[PDB]
PDB file of all heavy atoms in Angstrom:
ATOM      1  N   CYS A 145      -1.320 -12.317   0.384  1.00 51.02           N
ATOM      2  CA  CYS A 145      -0.111 -12.965  -0.125  1.00 51.02           C
ATOM      3  C   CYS A 145       1.091 -12.266   0.522  1.00 51.02           C
ATOM      4  O   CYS A 145       1.370 -11.108   0.223  1.00 51.02           O
ATOM      5  CB  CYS A 145      -0.045 -12.869  -1.640  1.00 51.02           C
ATOM      6  SG  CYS A 145       1.249 -13.871  -2.406  1.00 51.02           S
ATOM      7  N   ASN A 146       1.748 -12.970   1.445  1.00 52.49           N
ATOM      8  CA  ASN A 146       2.887 -12.400   2.133  1.00 52.49           C
ATOM      9  C   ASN A 146       4.085 -12.212   1.201  1.00 52.49           C
ATOM     10  O   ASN A 146       4.325 -12.998   0.298  1.00 52.49           O
ATOM     11  CB  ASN A 146       3.354 -13.364   3.227  1.00 52.49           C
ATOM     12  CG  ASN A 146       2.471 -13.439   4.406  1.00 52.49           C
ATOM     13  OD1 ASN A 146       2.042 -12.418   4.907  1.00 52.49           O
ATOM     14  ND2 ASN A 146       2.227 -14.655   4.909  1.00 52.49           N
ATOM     15  N   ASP A 147       4.879 -11.192   1.516  1.00 54.53           N
ATOM     16  CA  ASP A 147       6.220 -11.119   0.957  1.00 54.53           C
ATOM     17  C   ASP A 147       7.131 -12.171   1.616  1.00 54.53           C
ATOM     18  O   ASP A 147       6.888 -12.642   2.739  1.00 54.53           O
ATOM     19  CB  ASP A 147       6.805  -9.729   1.182  1.00 54.53           C
ATOM     20  CG  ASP A 147       6.981  -9.457   2.646  1.00 54.53           C
ATOM     21  OD1 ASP A 147       5.954  -9.192   3.337  1.00 54.53           O
ATOM     22  OD2 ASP A 147       8.135  -9.612   3.133  1.00 54.53           O
ATOM     23  N   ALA A 148       8.229 -12.491   0.926  1.00 52.52           N
ATOM     24  CA  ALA A 148       9.136 -13.529   1.415  1.00 52.52           C
ATOM     25  C   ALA A 148       9.902 -13.119   2.670  1.00 52.52           C
ATOM     26  O   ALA A 148      10.307 -13.990   3.442  1.00 52.52           O
ATOM     27  CB  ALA A 148      10.104 -13.900   0.328  1.00 52.52           C
ATOM     28  N   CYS A 149      10.155 -11.825   2.867  1.00 48.83           N
ATOM     29  CA  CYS A 149      10.811 -11.389   4.092  1.00 48.83           C
ATOM     30  C   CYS A 149       9.956 -11.733   5.314  1.00 48.83           C
ATOM     31  O   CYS A 149      10.428 -12.341   6.283  1.00 48.83           O
ATOM     32  CB  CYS A 149      11.159  -9.908   3.990  1.00 48.83           C
ATOM     33  SG  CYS A 149      11.764  -9.176   5.507  1.00 48.83           S
ATOM     34  N   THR A 150       8.677 -11.362   5.253  1.00 54.55           N
ATOM     35  CA  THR A 150       7.735 -11.690   6.309  1.00 54.55           C
ATOM     36  C   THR A 150       7.742 -13.186   6.621  1.00 54.55           C
ATOM     37  O   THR A 150       7.698 -13.583   7.787  1.00 54.55           O
ATOM     38  CB  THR A 150       6.325 -11.218   5.876  1.00 54.55           C
ATOM     39  OG1 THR A 150       6.332  -9.787   5.858  1.00 54.55           O
ATOM     40  CG2 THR A 150       5.237 -11.736   6.802  1.00 54.55           C
ATOM     41  N   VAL A 151       7.754 -14.017   5.585  1.00 52.12           N
ATOM     42  CA  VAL A 151       7.625 -15.458   5.788  1.00 52.12           C
ATOM     43  C   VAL A 151       8.924 -16.080   6.334  1.00 52.12           C
ATOM     44  O   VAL A 151       8.884 -16.907   7.241  1.00 52.12           O
ATOM     45  CB  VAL A 151       7.163 -16.158   4.513  1.00 52.12           C
ATOM     46  CG1 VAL A 151       7.085 -17.668   4.710  1.00 52.12           C
ATOM     47  CG2 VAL A 151       5.802 -15.620   4.096  1.00 52.12           C
ATOM     48  N   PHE A 152      10.073 -15.705   5.750  1.00 47.83           N
ATOM     49  CA  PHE A 152      11.308 -16.468   5.970  1.00 47.83           C
ATOM     50  C   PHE A 152      12.390 -15.752   6.747  1.00 47.83           C
ATOM     51  O   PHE A 152      13.317 -16.408   7.229  1.00 47.83           O
ATOM     52  CB  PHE A 152      11.861 -16.961   4.638  1.00 47.83           C
ATOM     53  CG  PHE A 152      10.960 -17.926   3.935  1.00 47.83           C
ATOM     54  CD1 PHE A 152      10.244 -17.559   2.800  1.00 47.83           C
ATOM     55  CD2 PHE A 152      10.818 -19.228   4.423  1.00 47.83           C
ATOM     56  CE1 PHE A 152       9.409 -18.462   2.168  1.00 47.83           C
ATOM     57  CE2 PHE A 152       9.992 -20.141   3.777  1.00 47.83           C
ATOM     58  CZ  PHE A 152       9.290 -19.748   2.651  1.00 47.83           C
ATOM     59  N   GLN A 153      12.317 -14.424   6.860  1.00 47.37           N
ATOM     60  CA  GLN A 153      13.203 -13.659   7.755  1.00 47.37           C
ATOM     61  C   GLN A 153      14.690 -13.899   7.451  1.00 47.37           C
ATOM     62  O   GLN A 153      15.498 -14.094   8.355  1.00 47.37           O
ATOM     63  CB  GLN A 153      12.898 -13.956   9.224  1.00 47.37           C
ATOM     64  CG  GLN A 153      11.486 -13.570   9.635  1.00 47.37           C
ATOM     65  CD  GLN A 153      11.392 -12.087   9.893  1.00 47.37           C
ATOM     66  OE1 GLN A 153      11.764 -11.614  10.973  1.00 47.37           O
ATOM     67  NE2 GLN A 153      10.897 -11.330   8.920  1.00 47.37           N
ATOM     68  N   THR A 154      15.047 -13.838   6.167  1.00 51.17           N
ATOM     69  CA  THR A 154      16.438 -13.961   5.764  1.00 51.17           C
ATOM     70  C   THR A 154      16.999 -12.614   5.328  1.00 51.17           C
ATOM     71  O   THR A 154      16.273 -11.718   4.852  1.00 51.17           O
ATOM     72  CB  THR A 154      16.636 -14.952   4.606  1.00 51.17           C
ATOM     73  OG1 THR A 154      16.035 -14.405   3.442  1.00 51.17           O
ATOM     74  CG2 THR A 154      16.062 -16.326   4.928  1.00 51.17           C
ATOM     75  N   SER A 155      18.322 -12.495   5.421  1.00 50.90           N
ATOM     76  CA  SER A 155      18.986 -11.306   4.935  1.00 50.90           C
ATOM     77  C   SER A 155      18.701 -11.074   3.457  1.00 50.90           C
ATOM     78  O   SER A 155      18.563  -9.930   3.000  1.00 50.90           O
ATOM     79  CB  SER A 155      20.504 -11.416   5.150  1.00 50.90           C
ATOM     80  OG  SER A 155      20.846 -11.457   6.520  1.00 50.90           O
ATOM     81  N   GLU A 156      18.620 -12.158   2.679  1.00 53.47           N
ATOM     82  CA  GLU A 156      18.408 -12.031   1.243  1.00 53.47           C
ATOM     83  C   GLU A 156      17.028 -11.442   0.931  1.00 53.47           C
ATOM     84  O   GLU A 156      16.897 -10.573   0.064  1.00 53.47           O
ATOM     85  CB  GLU A 156      18.589 -13.375   0.533  1.00 53.47           C
ATOM     86  CG  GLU A 156      18.673 -13.230  -0.973  1.00 53.47           C
ATOM     87  CD  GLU A 156      19.893 -12.467  -1.451  1.00 53.47           C
ATOM     88  OE1 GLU A 156      20.852 -12.271  -0.655  1.00 53.47           O
ATOM     89  OE2 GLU A 156      19.896 -12.116  -2.653  1.00 53.47           O
ATOM     90  N   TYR A 157      15.985 -11.938   1.595  1.00 50.93           N
ATOM     91  CA  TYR A 157      14.644 -11.436   1.295  1.00 50.93           C
ATOM     92  C   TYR A 157      14.396 -10.062   1.897  1.00 50.93           C
ATOM     93  O   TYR A 157      13.637  -9.264   1.335  1.00 50.93           O
ATOM     94  CB  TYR A 157      13.562 -12.384   1.807  1.00 50.93           C
ATOM     95  CG  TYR A 157      13.553 -13.731   1.148  1.00 50.93           C
ATOM     96  CD1 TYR A 157      13.365 -14.861   1.910  1.00 50.93           C
ATOM     97  CD2 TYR A 157      13.676 -13.878  -0.229  1.00 50.93           C
ATOM     98  CE1 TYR A 157      13.328 -16.124   1.337  1.00 50.93           C
ATOM     99  CE2 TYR A 157      13.661 -15.130  -0.815  1.00 50.93           C
ATOM    100  CZ  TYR A 157      13.508 -16.260  -0.032  1.00 50.93           C
ATOM    101  OH  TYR A 157      13.543 -17.490  -0.642  1.00 50.93           O
ATOM    102  N   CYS A 158      14.993  -9.800   3.049  1.00 51.19           N
ATOM    103  CA  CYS A 158      14.741  -8.587   3.787  1.00 51.19           C
ATOM    104  C   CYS A 158      15.720  -7.467   3.380  1.00 51.19           C
ATOM    105  O   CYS A 158      15.532  -6.319   3.754  1.00 51.19           O
ATOM    106  CB  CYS A 158      14.798  -8.871   5.277  1.00 51.19           C
ATOM    107  SG  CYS A 158      13.564 -10.110   5.822  1.00 51.19           S
ATOM    108  N   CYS A 159      16.730  -7.829   2.551  1.00 51.26           N
ATOM    109  CA  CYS A 159      17.765  -6.901   2.085  1.00 51.26           C
ATOM    110  C   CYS A 159      18.472  -6.194   3.222  1.00 51.26           C
ATOM    111  O   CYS A 159      18.845  -5.040   3.117  1.00 51.26           O
ATOM    112  CB  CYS A 159      17.217  -5.901   1.078  1.00 51.26           C
ATOM    113  SG  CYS A 159      18.449  -5.593  -0.191  1.00 51.26           S
ATOM    114  N   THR A 160      18.700  -6.928   4.290  1.00 55.15           N
ATOM    115  CA  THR A 160      19.195  -6.398   5.534  1.00 55.15           C
ATOM    116  C   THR A 160      20.453  -5.598   5.393  1.00 55.15           C
ATOM    117  O   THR A 160      20.603  -4.568   6.035  1.00 55.15           O
ATOM    118  CB  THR A 160      19.382  -7.581   6.473  1.00 55.15           C
ATOM    119  OG1 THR A 160      18.149  -8.309   6.533  1.00 55.15           O
ATOM    120  CG2 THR A 160      19.772  -7.131   7.849  1.00 55.15           C
ATOM    121  N   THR A 161      21.357  -6.089   4.558  1.00 55.06           N
ATOM    122  CA  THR A 161      22.643  -5.419   4.382  1.00 55.06           C
ATOM    123  C   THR A 161      22.694  -4.440   3.216  1.00 55.06           C
ATOM    124  O   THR A 161      23.725  -3.805   2.970  1.00 55.06           O
ATOM    125  CB  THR A 161      23.767  -6.447   4.186  1.00 55.06           C
ATOM    126  OG1 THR A 161      23.554  -7.151   2.962  1.00 55.06           O
ATOM    127  CG2 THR A 161      23.789  -7.452   5.322  1.00 55.06           C
ATOM    128  N   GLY A 162      21.594  -4.335   2.484  1.00 57.12           N
ATOM    129  CA  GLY A 162      21.579  -3.528   1.275  1.00 57.12           C
ATOM    130  C   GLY A 162      22.221  -4.184   0.062  1.00 57.12           C
ATOM    131  O   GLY A 162      22.528  -3.489  -0.902  1.00 57.12           O
ATOM    132  N   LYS A 163      22.370  -5.512  -0.042  1.00 57.32           N
ATOM    133  CA  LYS A 163      23.010  -6.096  -1.290  1.00 57.32           C
ATOM    134  C   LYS A 163      22.303  -7.279  -2.018  1.00 57.32           C
ATOM    135  O   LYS A 163      22.869  -8.011  -2.834  1.00 57.32           O
ATOM    136  CB  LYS A 163      24.468  -6.477  -1.014  1.00 57.32           C
ATOM    137  CG  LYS A 163      25.413  -5.301  -0.734  1.00 57.32           C
ATOM    138  CD  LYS A 163      25.585  -4.374  -1.940  1.00 57.32           C
ATOM    139  CE  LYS A 163      26.543  -4.943  -2.977  1.00 57.32           C
ATOM    140  NZ  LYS A 163      26.685  -4.030  -4.144  1.00 57.32           N
ATOM    141  N   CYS A 164      21.038  -7.429  -1.734  1.00 61.00           N
ATOM    142  CA  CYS A 164      20.252  -8.571  -2.138  1.00 61.00           C
ATOM    143  C   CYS A 164      19.967  -8.531  -3.628  1.00 61.00           C
ATOM    144  O   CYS A 164      20.097  -7.481  -4.283  1.00 61.00           O
ATOM    145  CB  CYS A 164      18.949  -8.521  -1.388  1.00 61.00           C
ATOM    146  SG  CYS A 164      18.054  -7.001  -1.714  1.00 61.00           S
ATOM    147  N   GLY A 165      19.549  -9.678  -4.158  1.00 61.55           N
ATOM    148  CA  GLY A 165      19.078  -9.735  -5.528  1.00 61.55           C
ATOM    149  C   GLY A 165      17.608 -10.107  -5.605  1.00 61.55           C
ATOM    150  O   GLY A 165      16.966 -10.399  -4.590  1.00 61.55           O
TER     151      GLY A 165
END
Side-chain angles (χ1 to χ4, degrees):
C145 190
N146 287 314
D147 64 285
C149 172
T150 292
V151 178
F152 296 107
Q153 298 280 279
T154 68
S155 295
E156 192 65 15
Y157 296 138
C158 300
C159 218
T160 306
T161 65
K163 293 295 282 179
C164 59

